Symmetry: C7
Subunit: 280 residues, 7 copies
């Protein structure tokens, strides 16, 4: 990248001959089961025209994948994490601005193949034309929500999943006979409904074992600011969907409702640029 | 590259034993939702015969993917980002010149395969001849617009997209029955038109979540210039297309109009070579 | 990662110009055959706002794959390791907190391919539509159990196995004629039941030769704590399943019972932050 | 390479413990739209027996892909860049010589596969013999023209292109019905001829957005030369082909004429070895 | 690994600013043809709380692949190395413990692919469902035998082999007509039995040319031990199988007997921690 | 390589703490169009027991691919470079010896695949056996001719080429109807013979644009030699084949004659070990 | 490897802060055409308990691929290199021992794939079961012959070769009609027998152009030995096979005889540990 313009590698980078004062802040929200981790670092370069503060948003959001309620032997429910989010807002009153952030949206790709085969038989000369298209489909998509001057956020959504090594079912899939089969253990089952759900081990790890974020947001502040202090708010949250299945006297049918429950864990941090330390 | 001519690696690069004064400038255009970031760096080498200034054009352009208007239950519209652009113009009056830039146009590639199979049966001896051709098709193409002495620009266009895991539709696709099906959720749908659009999550991330540029333009100025100051203009913009679909009493039909709306965000920066700092 | 924000590589890392006092603690639980290894390291940075202690949880858990009992020539049993676990709990009374941990849950992936071929014959014009989906299936899955402020744990489960190069059988597989064939050497066998089990060499290595963990948990403590001492508990364990097979007078039938035996090996370690050493 | 002869890496390279005086020279030929960039570097080693001067020939040649003229609604023309060239000549009078250059011609490669399958049916025993051959086909080929003592040149030619994801058409392709279909948007079109050309976005980037060279030519001069000064000439150029298509009352037909227009941009540079600087 | 917890690379490693006293000990057991090599190294860190001694168990075990005896022209035998082992035991009396070891058991993997193709003919609409599963099968498996506090061992077993580019035969394979064909040169042979064995060159190299181990076992000792001396025993061995084949008057038949001969080469080494040298 | 014997990387290499006096010698043979480049380097190590001199044989041999003569409209000829060579001889009188050289002969490789498929139909149970073999076929082979004490040489030969994306024709190919079709543009052509040759652009680059060698030969001389001077001869050459094609009144026929013309360019260099410089 | 035990990379390696006295010895055996090269290095570490001497066995063995004799126009012969060897023996009287050596035997690998496809037709429900197995087959195998305390040797054998892009023939192949076709240019040829052999260019390079070894053998000697001097013997050799083919009045038949000629080139070197130099 930088070496392609004939500039020596690392010349344009910053942080040289400086003393970065790092730190760490761990919080746990037992009500929502959302481990928090806000590792930061104050990079003060005399060459750079503004101060820096890279905020690492590590942590973990519990999957919370369990049957919330059961109604008899012919009806049951399941709540699973539809999407995890990590928002890092900054009051519009303050003069600090977010400079960069990572990861960011990337351009997809797909391979296209074309075929043209014709043969002869002894003579029924035939012709065949065919084209195939392939691409990768991650189970969860790390989408960077549109950032602005004071707010930056990420989200992880549910792309689709393969059930019992058959079919990439998704939230929008529907089958007139069986309905949505996203987490349906057996089709013509005879077992109790509450225990007719795909085992969490078979499902994706993030659904039950949780999602561990890893995001960065470097925020710069003017060096001649009147007040060297800016509070920041960091928000985690997960969105859960209710997956209902019931027996139609012939086979199980399953339905999924999108964005049923949403729980947000908000924390406020005070940054002291002069002291180069931010406190919980 | 450089090591192939027997020259020691990094010998021909510049920026050694020098003090680059980097910087940062963040602006947000809430009217157009276009985050801006003009990280720069002043590389002053005494060996090099001219001054340097590498301008990083980071930032983000919001996708702006939403149904702008709906007309009844049989007609609706959708505006999506057809192409993002980043232009970095320089007044022709000034004597500074752009030296390099990155990324640049690259040569495509494709694999070609040929087949020749003939067998016998017991005897209907047959012969088969076939050839296949495959290549990668990115959803968005990063095309570097033709640069000149005072102006350099980039653009990102819409190559094509795969809808519902079926067919790489593009802006020019047309089907006599259904028309352009670029963002058509369902063919024989019975739902309201305003809500018959492909979910933004299913579509590419750049359409709704925005595009984050990353470009570089090193501009050099004569060391004995009469005036050590040159203002520069940096322009972001996105081009949106209107995607109309209506019901023909039998099935949905969709049409796409190219380059319907264009919104440009222009900023002017003043560069002070003597002070080695450029201000907003 | 860090270099993408234009920050020099390693600037935000910690541990510079400091003297880490490492160590080692080896224990063997001959009753359960679980080798233990708690290599640690005390990273005390004056820049960092808290002390650090990275605990490596190396060791080994014996597979314990043997025929526990046999009942005649028509019935036998087999106990195999269903899942290994490594838990690192910390008393809620103490003020130390776990900061990070590794490895962590990762997002799966799968390739999707679509085909569309139509030809002509001389004319029985045919059409073919087909799609294939492929993905990797590790025998054992390293799932990170939901962590919290005081407790972090890992587990390794039995995804599935290929028997005699035919079929990826798993714990839930069932065949009405033969039943679960997870470890069935021969279908229409005539040998003694106790010796009709898949040879441990043919099976996966972890089943019989054991599993060697490799996990890390960095725990940070406030620098101004009233008492510089916190005891910690580290737990290994394995879960074994009973695999019964018997003769139905026509062919062997096998059944598997999940989570039959569980054996836990617990050790308590005292950490002395002031001395920078933790003793068994 | 060098390490395979047991010689320490970099021992045989040059440029150590020396002060290379680099530089830069930017010119723009608005008449032909050919950005120029002649970044150089004077490597003076006391160990090496001759002076060195590596000339980087960066820049850009505009694609110039547009419909030059239209004659009614049944005839039109198109001029596209057939091949870009970069020549670096040196007067035969001077005593300086070109030592090395990069890139250089490389040996192609291809995979060959052979098959032999015979089966039986119950018995019409058949036999099948088949072989397939695959290789990569870049759209543009970077051919290094035969160099000599005083002249070195490169050229980039048009290998072939894939049109509408169907067929790798080239300049020599011909079809009796439709003719050369290199840039034919539609076969049985009914639109005006001037607007029946493949969209430049669909075509390769280099055709319309231009080609950015990157070449190196190290030239050495005797250290005891009578005069320490040698002027050099650097030439860019592009060759354009006229692509005519007309309507035959039943379908469009297209023809291509090779090497219709050629425009050369020549610049002369004076090198001062004693001063270690070359001026425009 | 270590860099993922934000810790600088190599911070948690040991051996810095210390003087390791390495060594070497070569022995040859001409009776069993087992070259021995016990390269060691005494890593004494003042920061580490215990001494270290990494024992490299290099060497070589001869294949010993030859026809041990022949009985007429219709019966012959062959002894081949079924499995190589390397054991490093330590007397239970001593207080030294093994800390780590390498290589260790690794989790296998396999790719699973599913297909679903249905077409139409003009109309005999057909449907096709198919799934394929692929995985790698090394000829020899390096299994780490269950380690303990005082004993660590490795073994290399015979997974399977491909004979005459046809079939991956193994020790358990059986064919009612020909029997086990692991090393059967020809099926309907007419040559003497003693010379009807697969040429050792065609077979795997390890069978005849031997196996060269490469293993490591770091053992730590308390720094305040009463006596600074611990003797160690290192054992090599190979297990050979007798492969008998005889003529049944119509075709050759081969049978394999497992673990026929076992030869162990044991050596005892005395370690002097105070002197930092261990003698044969 | 060296690190596998536990020796620190680069320990056994030479050239440390020494001053290598490099150089350069450029010659051009306008009669044969063979650019020459003999970059050298005198590595004098006091630890090494002999002097060293690595001779780089860079340069370029022009392709010389043109129709040498035409005889009417039914006969024509073509001369193309059959093989390039680079020989570096040393007089047998001198006491200097060649120590090493690079590149060297490498062992080829090929993948072998075997298949065995049998199915049933409802029942015409069939069986299919098939095997495929694939390998890479470079157009030109870099063969190192057998070296000796005083002479080392390389050669590049014509393996085969693919013509019009159909068939890998070679010098030995023959077809009874059309003959050798190595460079036959059209089969049933009606154009003049002199202009019925494959365009040089379509052919391989080395045929017309030339071949650029890159070879190394380190030669060592006794340190106590009576005379510190040894002259050396370096020879380039190309071998050209005459490709004749004529019309048989029905179709073109082509024939190739091997090794028709050979042109050698020889240069003699005098080496002065005491002065550490070799002159043209 | 070493870093996995938490030991810093390179800690356990040797050769630090020491002065290795390298060397070189070149010999040529014109009688057998076997270039010799015995580059060595004396690594004397004060930490290591024994001296070291790594012997590089570079060189080259000429292929010697030519028709040794011809008997009329219906019989001819060909001698080709069946296998190259490099032996490095050491007198049993001396006390020096070989410590290590490289390369060493490696474990092969192969991929196994299984298929199971069943479809329906409208209904002739069919079932298909198939498995494929693929692996790489180098033309020449570098087998390390069983080493011992005083002797270490390598050999390179002839695995198999592909003739005319058809069939991997080997020394053991036999066809009742044509016989062994290893080097048979044409089957139903009518040319003289002496000139009916596969062109050496088409064959593998090592057969005619020779094989260039690259082997290492580090030998250690006790530091308190009574005499600091040990002579060593290094042996090259090649084994040639006689390939006879004759005409049976209908087609060519070829036969191969294994190990017809063997030529050994032996050299004796005297090592002076005290002087740290070994002389020819």
């Amino acid at each position: 990248a930088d070496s392609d313009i004939n500039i020596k590698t690392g010349t344009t980078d910053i942080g040289s001959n400086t003393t970065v004062k790092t730190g760490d802040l761990v919080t746990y929200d037992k009500e929502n089961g959302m481990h928090k981790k806000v590792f930061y670092s104050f990079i003060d370069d005399k060459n750079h025209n503004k101060k820096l503060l890279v905020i690492r948003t590590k942590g973990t959001i519990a999957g919370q994948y369990r049957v919330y309620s059961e109604e008899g032997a012919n009806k049951s429910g399941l709540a699973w994490p539809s999407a995890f989010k990590v928002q890092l807002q900054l009051p519009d009153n303050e003069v600090a601005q977010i400079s960069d952030y990572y990861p960011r949206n990337s351009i997809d790709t797909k391979e296209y193949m074309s075929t043209l085969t014709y043969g002869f038989n002894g003579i029924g000369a035939n012709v065949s034309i065919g084209h195939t298209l392939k691409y990768v489909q991650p189970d969860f998509k790390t989408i960077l929500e549109s950032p602005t001057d004071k707010k930056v956020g990420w989200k992880v959504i549910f792309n689709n999943m393969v059930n019992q090594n058959w079919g990439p079912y998704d939230r929008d899939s529907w089958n007139p006979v069986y309905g949505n089969q996203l987490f349906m253990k057996t089709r013509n089952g005879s077992m109790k409904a509450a225990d007719n759900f795909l085992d969490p081990n078979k499902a994706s790890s993030l659904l039950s074992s949780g999602f561990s974020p890893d995001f960065a947001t470097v925020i710069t502040m003017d060096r001649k600011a009147s007040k060297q202090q800016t509070n920041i708010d960091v928000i985690y949250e997960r969105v859960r969907d209710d997956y209902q299945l019931h027996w139609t006297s012939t086979n199980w049918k399953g339905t999924n409702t999108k964005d049923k429950w949403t729980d947000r864990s908000s924390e406020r941090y005070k940054i002291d640029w002069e002291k180069e330390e931010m406190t919980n």
